[PDB]
Amino acid sequence: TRTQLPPAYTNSFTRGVYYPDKVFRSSVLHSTQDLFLPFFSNVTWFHAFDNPVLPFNDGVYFASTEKSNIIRGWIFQSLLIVNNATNVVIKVCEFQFEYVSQPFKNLREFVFKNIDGYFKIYSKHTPINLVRDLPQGFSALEPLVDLPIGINITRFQTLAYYVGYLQPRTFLLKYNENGTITDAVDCALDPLSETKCTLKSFTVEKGIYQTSNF
Amino acid sequence: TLVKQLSSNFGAISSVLNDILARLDPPEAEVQIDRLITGRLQSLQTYVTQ
Amino acid sequence: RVQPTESIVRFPNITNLCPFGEVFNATRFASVYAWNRKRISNCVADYSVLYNSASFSTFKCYGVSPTKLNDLCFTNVYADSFVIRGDEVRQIAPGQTGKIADYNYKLPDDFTGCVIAWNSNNLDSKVGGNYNYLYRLFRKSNLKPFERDISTEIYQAGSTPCNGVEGFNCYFPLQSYGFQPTYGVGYQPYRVVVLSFELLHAPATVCGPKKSTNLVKNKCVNFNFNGLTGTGVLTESNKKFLPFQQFGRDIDDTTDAVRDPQTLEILDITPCSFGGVSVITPGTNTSNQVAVLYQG
Amino acid sequence: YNSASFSTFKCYGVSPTKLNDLCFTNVYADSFVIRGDEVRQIAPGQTGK
Ligand SMILES: *[C@@H]1O[C@H](CO)[C@@H](O[C@@H]2O[C@H](CO)[C@@H](O)[C@H](O)[C@H]2NC(C)=O)[C@H](O)[C@H]1NC(C)=O
Ligand SMILES: *[C@@H]1O[C@H](CO)[C@@H](O)[C@H](O)[C@H]1NC(C)=O
Ligand SMILES: *[C@@H]1O[C@H](CO)[C@@H](O)[C@H](O)[C@H]1NC(C)=O
Ligand SMILES: *[C@@H]1O[C@H](CO)[C@@H](O)[C@H](O)[C@H]1NC(C)=O
Ligand SMILES: *[C@@H]1O[C@H](CO)[C@@H](O)[C@H](O)[C@H]1NC(C)=O
Ligand SMILES: *[C@@H]1O[C@H](CO)[C@@H](O)[C@H](O)[C@H]1NC(C)=O
Ligand SMILES: *[C@@H]1O[C@H](CO)[C@@H](O)[C@H](O)[C@H]1NC(C)=O
Incomplete structure (x- = not known):
């Protein structure tokens, strides 16, 4: 059985950030640039029979709302990421490098990037009992493990959820007293955004500000 | 602006003096050190004039 | 300025040795056409073996x-690791142009490491010529750093179809070295190994043979941690880091908090170099007693 | 060409x-004209008749 059904649509609302490095900061406004998810972008919401081969771009944003662990792993020689009741399976071959870690209403998010021959995994477990459109709450996706395989990946196949695409952008991450991400503001979205970016502050007063050149 | 100018590489291998010292040799360390000296000195000149 | 007294080391925790015999002293080596890459981690290298x-x-x-x-x-x-003609050794250099540097593995301009090479008399040579080793000769475009080519299509010149359509202006991009014992020293095969690495980009994984020392506190001394070095008073901290976070910065993005790989604790770094001298005098003519002053 | x-x-x-x-x-x-057995003779590093 392989059924067909037209795809749906939805919009991102200020979701998806992760620590660009392993370093700690406290109550500062450190600025950085990387491959992030731009704010207010179309999210191709896939509702489940359907499992097409999704084109793995430079950076994705995988997030499932809540199920009974029907999702087990993903597809990426070929990377075999999958989870069983026993140790999570990490293998690399054309199944028809290997590694295992440990035997294994809400909301889960995952981002996949591949730079310098490194496969990074940022994730976050959020207990949320909201509705089809995910709510608006700022949170980060801490790193879990970095297994390097350094191979050529172009396609990924899943095993109700959302997917998105990352782009090279410059952000501004606000840090609290405990060094946790609480607020994020961009400066490639709206004129107010780049004003806030160049002034390096979260409040702007009346006046004129020079931003860039045309 | 002065303090932030420190992190600038100024066309050298790195920015930390201790880091450059460890991985280089005294016979030819003159290049990076000289470039850093010139850059930071010029920054001081501008700041003092202002 | 306050002067530091001692030095402390909390650098290593590994014990395994880096696999190197197969890297250098062995004989089975891939051609320069297809160069192998090896991953090394969680061990200690030795210059005494190399130097x-x-x-x-x-x-x-x-x-x-x-x-x-x-x-x-x-x-x-x-x-x-790869094997090339001794005449081709000079072409392997940062930014130096060369046929192997144009159509085969090309060294980046900013490469930070070392290259070790030695001649092979007959280990990788045949009396009739070692034709297993090949070097790329013809290519439509140049390569980028750390790249490989696997297509063996016949090179295309002019408008004549090639890459399967064998004919005029069509040539095989790969040529046999044909190393022989009778060949000249410059034409003898050379065994060259290229090693590269990165510095201060990630937690320590491959550290030097130097062992650690004890841990002192409340006195500014030289400290080293995974490569980072500095001078300042070390003391306990109250800020709690994430289980993965190692370093610590400030508004100035300067190192001020470190994690000991042994004790696994939040350590504070405070400046110890400070002071300025001001001398007040009643005048040389009047008297000679002086009263020093320290500014800060 | x-x-x-x-x-x-x-x-x-x-x-x-x-x-x-x-x-x-x-x-x-x-410019000159040669035989078919002499084509390779006219080449750098090539000698003969
Ligand atoms: C940063 O952490 C501190 C310490 O947990 C938070 O301050 C409160 O500390 C008391 C200790 O008696 C706890 O019972 C409270 O639960 C803490 N507050 C919270 C909200 O957890 C402080 O709030 C934290 N900062 C932020 C922005 O959450
Ligand atoms: C999302 O896609 C739909 C149709 O593909 C389009 O009408 C809409 O404008 C897109 N969203 C934005 C913000 O442009
Ligand atoms: C789960 O799947 C892995 C995959 O190889 C297998 O090794 C393991 O035995 C499985 N465990 C159970 C309980 O099915
Ligand atoms: C990756 O694979 C695709 C499809 O085979 C190919 O077009 C692309 O050139 C490859 N890139 C690299 C860097 O190997
Ligand atoms: C490594 O650290 C552990 C725990 O701090 C300690 O017990 C052990 O002796 C250390 N070994 C080395 C080689 O540093
Ligand atoms: C094998 O390699 C080691 C280090 O890689 C070296 O010390 C040793 O001499 C080699 N054995 C030989 C050359 O027989
Ligand atoms: C010192 O001062 C006194 C009075 O102020 C004056 O008479 C004397 O000449 C001075 N001596 C010198 C060496 O300046």
Whole structure:
């Protein structure tokens, strides 16, 4: 059985950030640039029979709302990421490098990037009992493990959820007293955004500000 | 602006003096050190004039 | 200025040795057409094996002096090995143009590491010529750093179809070296190994042979941690880091908090160099007693 | 170069693909007719009769 059904649509609302490095900061406004998810972008919401081969771009944003662990792993020689009741399976071959870690209403998010021959995994477990459109709450996706395989990946196949695409952008991450991400503001979205970016502050007063050149 | 100018590489291998010292040799360390000296000195000149 | 008194080391925790015999002293080596890459982690390298034992033919280290090699911890060591003609050795250089540097593995301009080479008399040579080794000769476009080509399509020249349509202006991009014992020294095969690494980009994975020392507190002393070094008073901290976070910065993005790989605790760093002298005098003519002052 | 009407077409020491691109000082040519057993004799590093 392989059924067909037209795809749906939805919009991102200020979701998806992760620590660009392993370093700690406290109550500062450190600025950085990387491959992030731009704010207010179309999210191709896939509702489940359907499992097409999704084109793995430079950076994705995988997030499932809540199920009974029907999702087990993903597809990426070929990377075999999958989870069983026993140790999570990490293998690399054309199944028809290997590694295992440990035997294994809400909301889960995952981002996949591949730079310098490194496969990074940022994730976050959020207990949320909201509705089809995910709510608006700022949170980060801490790193879990970095297994390097350094191979050529172009396609990924899943095993109700959302997917998105990352782009090279410059952000501004606000840090609290405990060094946790609480607020994020961009400066490639709206004129107010780049004003806030160049002034390096979260409040702007009346006046004129020079931003860039045309 | 002065303090932030420190992190600038100024066309050298790195920015930390201790880091450059460890991985280089005294016979030819003159290049990076000289470039850093010139850059930071010029920054001081501008700041003092202002 | 306050002067530091002692020095402390909390640098290593590993015990395994880096696999190197197969890297260098062995004989099975891939062609320059297809160069193998090896991953090395969680062990200790030794310059004494490389610098001291034997002499080989090349010890050209770029970016970092060889004498200080096994003194700074690295991250993600990568090793590359291949065999080329001795006449082609000079072409392997940062930014130097060359046929192998144009159509085969090309060294980046900013490469930071070392290259070791030595001649092969007959180990990889045949009396009739070692034709297994091949070198790329013809290519439509140049390569980018750390790239490989696997297509064996017949090179295309002019408008005549090639790459399967054998004919005029069509040539095989790969040529056999044909190493022979009777060949000249410059034409003899040379065994060259390329090693590369990264510095201060990630937690320590491959550290030097130097062992750790005890841990002192409340006195500004030289400290080293995975490569980072500095001077300042070390003391306990109250800020709690994430289980993965190691370093610590400030508004100025300067190191002020470190995690000991042994004790696994939040350590504070405070400046110890400070002071300025002001001398007040009643005048040389009047008297000679003076009263020093320290500014801060 | 694109005529493709020759039994022998090669540039020694220079790239025939890029010849209409750089300026020289002087150009000279010698023309003659030889046998089929003597074609390879006229070549750099080649000797014979
Ligand atoms: C940063 O952490 C501190 C310490 O947990 C938070 O301050 C409160 O500390 C008391 C200790 O008696 C706890 O019982 C409270 O639960 C803490 N507050 C919270 C909200 O957890 C402080 O709030 C934290 N900062 C932020 C922005 O959450
Ligand atoms: C999302 O896609 C739909 C149709 O593909 C389009 O009408 C809409 O404008 C897109 N969203 C934005 C913000 O442009
Ligand atoms: C789960 O799957 C892995 C995959 O190889 C297998 O090794 C393991 O035995 C499985 N465990 C159970 C309980 O099915
Ligand atoms: C990756 O694979 C695709 C499809 O085979 C190919 O077009 C692309 O050139 C490859 N890239 C690299 C860097 O190998
Ligand atoms: C490594 O650290 C552990 C725990 O701090 C300690 O017990 C052990 O002796 C250390 N070994 C080395 C080689 O540093
Ligand atoms: C094997 O390699 C080691 C280090 O890689 C070296 O010390 C040793 O001499 C080699 N054995 C030989 C050359 O027989
Ligand atoms: C010192 O001062 C006194 C009075 O102020 C004056 O008479 C004397 O000449 C001075 N001596 C010198 C060496 O300046």
